[PDB]
């Protein structure tokens, strides 16, 4: 009902800076709470740096839910949003 189908999604296909910041913060917190890491870590130790490395490779297992003003929403995977 409220969910919007993937074919009719009309929001921007890019990761906004607020979404990028929130995704990085959440992923860093989750990694700091011993969540599995989906990318190989060479010598990195900072959770924020690991989160940025995951984001650059489109490996973050999170979904953005963008709320339209009327209450409907669109679910975008972080692996399908374009990041600068």
């Amino acid at each position: 009902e409220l969910a919007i189908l993937k074919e009719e999604r009309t929001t921007t296909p890019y990761l906004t800076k607020y979404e990028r910041a929130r995704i990085l913060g959440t992923r860093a917190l989750q990694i700091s709470m011993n969540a599995p890491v989906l990318v190989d870590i060479e010598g990195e130790t900072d959770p924020l740096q690991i989160a940025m490395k995951e984001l650059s490779q489109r490996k973050i297992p999170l979904v953005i839910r963008r709320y339209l003003p009327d209450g409907s929403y669109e679910d975008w995977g972080c692996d399908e949003l374009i990041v600068d």
Partner: protein, 160 residues
Amino acid sequence: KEPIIVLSPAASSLVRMSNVKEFLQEGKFLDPSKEPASSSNLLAIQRKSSRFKTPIKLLVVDNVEKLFTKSEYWDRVVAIVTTGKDWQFKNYKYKDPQILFQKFNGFYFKYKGDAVPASVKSWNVKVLDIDRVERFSDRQVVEQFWDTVENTLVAKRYKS
């Protein structure tokens, strides 16, 4: 005698023998992981430049063990592509990376936004960035690479 361009046989290299021709010559970048592996370790490419009246023919070599029996071949080397790995240089003319990189042009290809390896930052090599999504900048990156290579070729007074 055609000049030689040396590529890293590492599997993590963004430029391999499979996609080197379409990248350096045609200017279009393809992901080498999806491309099938190339059986031939020798390839020839053509470069068109405003600095030269005629296109230049160059030889691309992945492994120098079977193609660098003579020392005079090292005089033809105009570019070296490395993945930041020390073990590439076990059989090279200068087994130490530093001296090799002051005596030869070193290039490292990385995706835009990725962090440079520590050994690469400690070496005298150029850094070339390829965007993951937009494909119009591939020609620009190739142009930078060829600008450096052509500067080296003109400095060597090569005849074509």
